[PDB]
Design a protein around this nucleic acid. Structure first.
Ligand SMILES: [Mg+2]
Ligand SMILES: [Mg+2]
Ligand SMILES: [Mg+2]
Ligand SMILES: [Mg+2]
Ligand SMILES: [Mg+2]
Ligand SMILES: [Mg+2]
Ligand SMILES: [Mg+2]
Ligand SMILES: [Mg+2]
Ligand SMILES: [Mg+2]
Ligand SMILES: [Mg+2]
Ligand SMILES: [Mg+2]
Ligand SMILES: [Mg+2]
Ligand SMILES: [Mg+2]
Ligand SMILES: [Mg+2]
Ligand SMILES: [Mg+2]
Ligand SMILES: [Mg+2]
Ligand SMILES: [Mg+2]
Ligand SMILES: [Mg+2]
Ligand SMILES: [Mg+2]
Ligand SMILES: [Mg+2]
Ligand SMILES: [Mg+2]
Ligand SMILES: [Mg+2]
Ligand SMILES: [Mg+2]
Lengths: 52, 147, 52, 124, 52, 187
RNA sequence: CCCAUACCCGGCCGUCGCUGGCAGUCGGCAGAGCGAGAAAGAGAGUGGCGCGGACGCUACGCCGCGACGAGUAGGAGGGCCGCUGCGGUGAGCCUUGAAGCCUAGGGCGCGG
RNA sequence: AGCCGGGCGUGGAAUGCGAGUGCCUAGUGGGCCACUUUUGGUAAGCAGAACUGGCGCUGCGGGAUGAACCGAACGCCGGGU
RNA sequence: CUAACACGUGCGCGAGUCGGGGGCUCGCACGAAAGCCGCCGUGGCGCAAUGAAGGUGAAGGCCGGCGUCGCCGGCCGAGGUGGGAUCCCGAGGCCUUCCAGUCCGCCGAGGGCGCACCACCGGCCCGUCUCGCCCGCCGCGCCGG
RNA sequence: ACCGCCCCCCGGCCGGCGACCGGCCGCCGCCGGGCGCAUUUCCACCGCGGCGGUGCGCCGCGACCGGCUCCGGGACGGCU
RNA sequence: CCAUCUAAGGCUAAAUACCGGCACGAGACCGAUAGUCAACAAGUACCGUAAGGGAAAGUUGAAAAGAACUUUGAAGAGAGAGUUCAAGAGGGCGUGAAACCGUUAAGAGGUAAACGGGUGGGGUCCGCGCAGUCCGCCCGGAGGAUUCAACCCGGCGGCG
């Protein structure tokens, strides 16, 4: 959906503060576990030291 | 990954997918491109004609930069400038024609392939083709040479 | 939303980036079946078993 | 939506346990404790759960409310029923049916309630 | 041998797509709970607190 | 004992997309239901083309789409393509179209929306027309890939205009023996 | 009169085909069908008490009909077969006893 | 000869059966046997061909025994023939 | 295992695409990661081919102006035949007291528009051959078209 | 200066609030407390009581029905 | 004709290289037949005239608390006793497999043994078997409850 609700900002006391911010458009992006898994797999290989 | 490869499924079959009569020996036919004219002649002639022999002249100190000459076509010619340029020229009434310089965008020769929209253009380039020239003249416009 | 841009606004902090386009918008399959305009153009559901 | 997250979670859940040619689902509001689209208690907007009471006797019925879908703290309403089995089952049946609240789980909820109740009765 | 292909490169657009998908999925209570996080008491899972 | 052969017993066609993404699979669910509970074969064709691979769903250009929709009789109908609609830059005038595709290039979408048409996705297409009346089913040029220039009757063989596999184009690369009557033979 | 792994009838496993069926779980807000030789509407309209009803549907699921099943070299698919390490996850297990090893004990899977 | 336009369906033998098409590709390139035809040879369980079927790659009933003969080809079982 | 190539498959973007090299990010548990560069796309591959090379370099179809038009305008626009999944139309046709009379939906002779793709016929670009005439000028030539 | 896009304010429409609600009213359901006071409601026990479902601790037998088979005994008729 | 340098003398840091050396950090690596040949008195023992070749070899226990003392024997070696959570950890001692061997128990035995199919017999253990299932809805009888329906108050939820 294209609806962007209003998200409240919670104070450090845990209760709702008066402020609130609209939901950023990023959270409506498509969910693709395929791409997420592919990018993780291939990137969690770039912090790897050689062995031989 | 080694998990998905054919070797894992091949364990236990003595042969390893290479036959019992003709084994997997080292280099049965010779290494590399050996026997191109003797015992691989049929394959070479059937799939790479013209491989053997010489043709043409030799140019020793070839410099690609001398012959560098990128080309553009008339259908792409209007994409060099912004759309607002073209629409302003289109609804202009004074008869003024926009100037398109392909050398600025990195093209040297203009070749005339596509259809050209009916509005005057001042195309300035380094080299032109006869058909591109006649297309520009027919649509109404000017051809300008630069060095 | 400045980092990743909205649907109609490009990302300001990145050179040229925009949110990936949705392949399907209304992903409520339950609705997409249970809506009148699609249920009208359907044949009767044959649901009686014919054993040997 | 719902089908989208179901496709996401059908095989990559922490509540999933698969062994002995079986598969089971663990999240709280899931009658029959099995991995299925109908009975998955976290996907749907309207969800029913039946749990044993915190006290040694009684049954807690949990109903997902309609407004706070993204507010987990205030998303479930819990009611404790501590009576005879027949009236407990009748109340659960009325709650499921006369509210038009996810009617496909009526028999599952009744079966689960009956069970919890028996468990609560002292052993022989 | 030490010259095995240890590292991999992924397209920048694909990396951004994966990041967007992860961010969008972090806002759904079902997926966060299925990840195992205990958030049944959290007032609102797109949890925002002030800059204090 | 039965005198039969089992070579061609099993058919090779696809039963489901090889892809693993979830949006395409949801589309496949919806169109599976539509195809099996509707007598219209447009749904069957669309579902079959959803199953297909990337190289079997070539992109369709804006120029192709406008050219195929400018034909007589097919005014104000929705152009349905299971591939990708890519922009064509060598076309200035673009009319208003009612397009449906899995994905559309950003520039192509901008062009259509500026021209005044509307972009549809196969979901909303189901809602608009379940059996798909008033639809023009198009597809990109499948033989457009350059791999098809290497296929067919082998080069170096008479009346075969097949592109050879050469690492570099030039006068020193496959031009001497089989390509000239002056050196050996000419095929 | 006798009998083969052949043929006929029946059960079970699997494969292939029907690119078969099921989103209709449409319930006091309802009315339980789309097996029936005949391409297509249980069509919409205007004038002469008792509160009640099993299972389902990991749709990568479930269900129904037919046909078929030899195999070296070789090809392909599925393995909730197995070994070691890594990222996640099991508010996992464990000195009230882990790994490993032995067993005339109880079982599962066609098999690993 | 090529073009256009128009009219004719009792789909013009029997029987059977879905068909067409495109890529990539392993192994193989020592064969042997049998009825019939057949060349060399005194002849051979010899050497060499044609057609078809087999063995090789194949278990099962029979020929006591058996690579090829006769019958018949194979998922695990019960009954009948 | 590395490199190269081919083809098939999955994903992102798409006439574009790709930071692999470098740089900016208080360097540094993870982090030797990750993010960013866009006037760092140099550059590679693709978007144009052909010829040994000098080089050249990819449609055209109708009316008014001198059919026995020189030649300017008005236009229209990237072929044609056959086969073609789908879609459009639709003669007729889908019921019940009768009768007038509708709405909506399904059926369907024939007829349309015809995707991809195949076959065939034309057309255009480069090399080469044969025939023949015409045109342009800053330098009228072993010139150019 | 002009054009395109975007953010914000105001005004007018369209749609959604089931990836995104508050108040009022109505209906329904549930829960807690009184009212209710036992021909109602509930809990536990007994009968070798009945109906329906699933099974028998082990070892057995019979009956009828249907499918597939092998065989026997009768009777009738046609070309002859 | 043009273009561009000024040879046959000299110096010069930075960006660059680094399986030796000193001092460090780390690892999707190996885990005592692996990883360096070398985890240990390893380039050691040992071989060759010499050039040179070149191993095997980790683990008691938390702590030696490492078994005082009696007894048989010449002694090795035992029986008692003792330490320990454990000697079922006793100085090449964690765990302790297979091949192979001794003994005990059971069974069998003239076509080498072994094997597939089908039964039968005997065993070790198991069912923690040995008067045989439970579940609704009724009917009848013996009981006992702070008891049902309907209303009122308050709260909550669903739908419009
Ligand atoms: Mg094999
Ligand atoms: Mg070979
Ligand atoms: Mg090789
Ligand atoms: Mg068979
Ligand atoms: Mg095959
Ligand atoms: Mg049978
Ligand atoms: Mg087989
Ligand atoms: Mg043993
Ligand atoms: Mg050979
Ligand atoms: Mg012979
Ligand atoms: Mg064969
Ligand atoms: Mg045979
Ligand atoms: Mg004999
Ligand atoms: Mg038999
Ligand atoms: Mg000098
Ligand atoms: Mg000098
Ligand atoms: Mg010097
Ligand atoms: Mg570090
Ligand atoms: Mg060891
Ligand atoms: Mg040891
Ligand atoms: Mg011990
Ligand atoms: Mg030991
Ligand atoms: Mg004995």
């Amino acid at each position: 959906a294209c609806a962007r609700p209003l998200i409240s900002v919670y104070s450090e006391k845990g209760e709702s503060s008066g402020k609130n911010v609209t939901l950023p458009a990023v959270f409506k992006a498509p969910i693709r576990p395929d791409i997420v898994n592919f990018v993780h797999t291939n990137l969690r290989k770039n912090n790897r030291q050689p062995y031989a | 990954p080694s998990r998905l490869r054919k070797t894992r499924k091949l364990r236990g079959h003595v042969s390893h997918g290479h036959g019992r009569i003709g084994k997997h020996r080292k280099h049965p036919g010779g290494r590399g491109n050996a026997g191109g004219m003797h015992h691989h002649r049929i394959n070479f002639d059937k799939y790479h004609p013209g491989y053997f022999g010489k043709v043409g002249m030799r140019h020793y100190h070839l410099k690609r930069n001398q012959s560098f000459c990128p080309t553009v076509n008339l259908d792409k010619l209007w994409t060099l400038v912004s759309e607002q340029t073209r629409v302003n020229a289109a609804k202009n009434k004074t008869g003024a024609a926009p100037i398109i310089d392909v050398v600025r965008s990195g093209y040297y020769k203009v070749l005339g392939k596509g259809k050209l929209p009916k509005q005057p253009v001042i195309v300035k380039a380094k080299f032109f083709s006869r058909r591109a020239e006649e297309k520009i003249k027919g649509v109404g416009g000017a051809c300008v040479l630069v060095a | 939303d400045d980092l990743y841009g909205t649907w109609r606004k490009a990302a300001s902090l990145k050179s040229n980036y925009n949110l990936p386009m949705h392949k399907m918008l209304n992903t409520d399959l339950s609705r997409i079946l249970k809506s009148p305009e699609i249920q009208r153009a359907l044949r009767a559901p044959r649901k009686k078993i014919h054993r040997r | 939506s719902a089908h989208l997250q179901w496709m996401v979670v059908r095989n990559c859940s922490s509540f999933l346990i698969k062994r002995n040619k079986q598969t089971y689902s663990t999240e709280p509001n899931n009658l029959k404790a099995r991995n299925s689209f109908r009975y998955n208690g976290l996907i749907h907007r309207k969800t029913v759960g039946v749990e044993p009471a915190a006290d040694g006797k009684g049954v807690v019925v949990v109903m997902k409310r309609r407004s706070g879908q993204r507010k987990p703290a205030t998303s479930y309403v819990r009611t404790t029923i501590n009576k005879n089995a027949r009236a407990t089952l009748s109340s659960i049946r009325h709650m499921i049916r006369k509210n038009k609240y996810h009617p496909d789980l009526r028999m599952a909820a009744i079966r689960r309630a009956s069970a919890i109740l028996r468990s609560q009765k002292p052993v022989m | 041998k030490t010259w095995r292909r240890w590292h991999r490169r992924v397209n920048t657009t694909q990396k951004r797509y994966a990041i967007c998908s992860a961010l969008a999925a972090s806002a759904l209570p079902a997926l966060v709970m299925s990840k195992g996080h205990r958030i049944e008491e959290v007032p609102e899972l797109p949890l925002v607190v002030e800059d204090k | 004992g039965v005198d039969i052969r089992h070579n061609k017993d099993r058919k090779v066609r696809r039963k489901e997309p090889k892809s693993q993404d979830i949006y395409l699979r949801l589309l496949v669910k919806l169109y599976r239901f539509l195809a099996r509970r509707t007598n219209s074969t447009f749904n069957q064709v669309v579902l079959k083309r959803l199953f297909m691979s990337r190289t079997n769903r070539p992109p369709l250009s804006l120029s192709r789409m406008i050219r195929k929709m400018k034909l007589p009789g097919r005014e104000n109908k929705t152009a349905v393509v299971v591939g990708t609609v890519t922009d064509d830059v060598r076309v200035q005038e673009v009319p208003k179209l009612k397009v449906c595709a899995l994905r559309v290039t950003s520039r192509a979408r901008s062009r259509i929306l500026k021209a005044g048409g509307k972009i549809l996705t196969f979901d909303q297409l189901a809602l608009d027309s379940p059996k798909g009346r008033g639809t023009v089913l198009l597809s990109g040029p499948r033989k457009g890939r350059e791999v098809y220039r290497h296929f067919g009757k082998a080069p170096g063989t008479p009346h075969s205009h097949t592109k050879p596999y050469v690492r570099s184009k030039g006068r020193k690369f496959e031009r001497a023996r089989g390509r000239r009557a002056s050196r050996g033979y000419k095929n």
